[PDB]
Amino acid sequence: NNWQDYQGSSLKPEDFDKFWDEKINLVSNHQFEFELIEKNLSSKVVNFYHLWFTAIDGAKIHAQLIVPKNLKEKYPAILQFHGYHCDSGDWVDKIGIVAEGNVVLALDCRGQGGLSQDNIQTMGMTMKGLIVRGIDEGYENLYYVRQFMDLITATKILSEFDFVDETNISAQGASQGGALAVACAALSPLIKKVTATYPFLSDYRKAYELGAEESAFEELPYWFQFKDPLHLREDWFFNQLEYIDIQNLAPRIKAEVIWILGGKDTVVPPITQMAAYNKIQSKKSLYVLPEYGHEYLPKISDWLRE
Amino acid sequence: WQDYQGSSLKPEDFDKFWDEKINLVSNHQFEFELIEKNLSSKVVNFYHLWFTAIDGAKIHAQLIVPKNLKEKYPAILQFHGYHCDSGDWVDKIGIVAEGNVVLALDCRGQGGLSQDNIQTMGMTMKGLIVRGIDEGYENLYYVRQFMDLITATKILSEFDFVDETNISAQGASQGGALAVACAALSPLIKKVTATYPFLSDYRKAYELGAEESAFEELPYWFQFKDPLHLREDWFFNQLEYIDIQNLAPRIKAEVIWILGGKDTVVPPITQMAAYNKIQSKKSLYVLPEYGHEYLPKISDWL
Ligand SMILES: [Ca+2]
Ligand SMILES: [Ca+2]
16 A cells, blocks of 8 residues: 555656756667668568667667568567566567567667677776666766667667557566666657566665665665775765666656566565656556566466456 | 696687787886875875776776885785775785885776776676677786786886885785786796685586686576577687686796685685696695685784
């Protein structure tokens, strides 16, 4: 019941919206060069393509493109994002949803398990963690600033396909993928639907307050342990992360939201995700599996088919 | 433990590769700068030492000097552990008060002030052993980190108040590995005191199951970049160039090797791959009840 009343712990800066408005404009006015190279996997109902484009910062970004065989008609499209450390997953995992008449764009995050390039440069700590990668040069140099812009760029390219129904584009993902799906719908309001599973990257100040050494937010106490153990720049540190806290993007969402989480999740605490969910103002639904944690959630996928 | 020969597959080009890097540093005039540290002491002065490496990165070190300077002093290069920095300035007051010069080097991008400028198309999430491995061993993080050791030794020896004939190196874990590597790439070093050195016997460290050790990056890379082990041979062939057991034979300094018997962070078997290949005067000290932690009593004993 209190999850409704949790307003979050963020300190949204006045300049937040101007920053992201400018980034949206930059993507819209940029003509992106991309390339499609078919991957050799034999199927009777689907074709597979490597999608390579150059981001606004020069980095080479990779995505999985999975399309039906008949391309003479337009299909609804689904943007799918993956979890921390992982990649876009097995190609065959997309055969079912595209066989129903959909186009899937599975984006690879920069410098993780996939093929996308990380080109963040910094004078500070590069040992571990991608939330704080580049934090010394300010929020403008944060890794997720470019990672969020890849979502807008992927949506732009996906929307301009002659076989993609631009009116029915949706986003889905788990953990980090849930955060990126939420950010993708907020930064590209054309998105019609979002299905986010225990989204990450939310309420950094609260995630630190809970004690994050065993959570997915462990890089935050790690940074203080080795970069600022006396907490001399605590305010400055969390002020940079405000620009990549998805709860600050949540109000801008116009898509329908389906939110799924596990009640025993200690990797991504439910309280930090509710900071973002409570600030969604469009149509939203919240589904909980009490006995499950940061893991595969059964049955819920059949429930939503209805 | 004496007869363990290591698991390395030393590449044909290994010595030719590192000989060129030593020559490159030896023939290069490095630009450095000294900036006063505000720490107040009656027996020592503290200085920020900033130099630019041959690759452009800005490298930082702590320089701690006695108050007098008209005569030469023995010098000590000191290196730190994984994730850490050069430590508190006051930790060096005692050793410098005895008439020594301490250069405490900060590793690149590891919590200290030194810059990491490795660029790669591959995984940047975690780990500095495998940082830049996709572009080959030339782009490995520790190739430039090892050259910083040679460069730091170069600058330290060229001070008019440093007795270049009595330069030694010390460190623990990563610092122990860098201390060992420092002696191999600069044989002028007279003494090495290495405490449970890291960065040795990568193939064996993986074979033991490294998920709970300091080598966890190696299974991590396979877990997310190559789960079917399609490039296992290529992976460990790149790491040969930064395995200190391959550098150990060229060491001429006397070596003091200290380790803890219960160490699961850096298993002793990987350390012995490097220690057994040292051919100069060497001694081995073991604390059976201690692990990867502070080792008492041994400092007084020496
Ligand atoms: Ca592939
Ligand atoms: Ca300082």
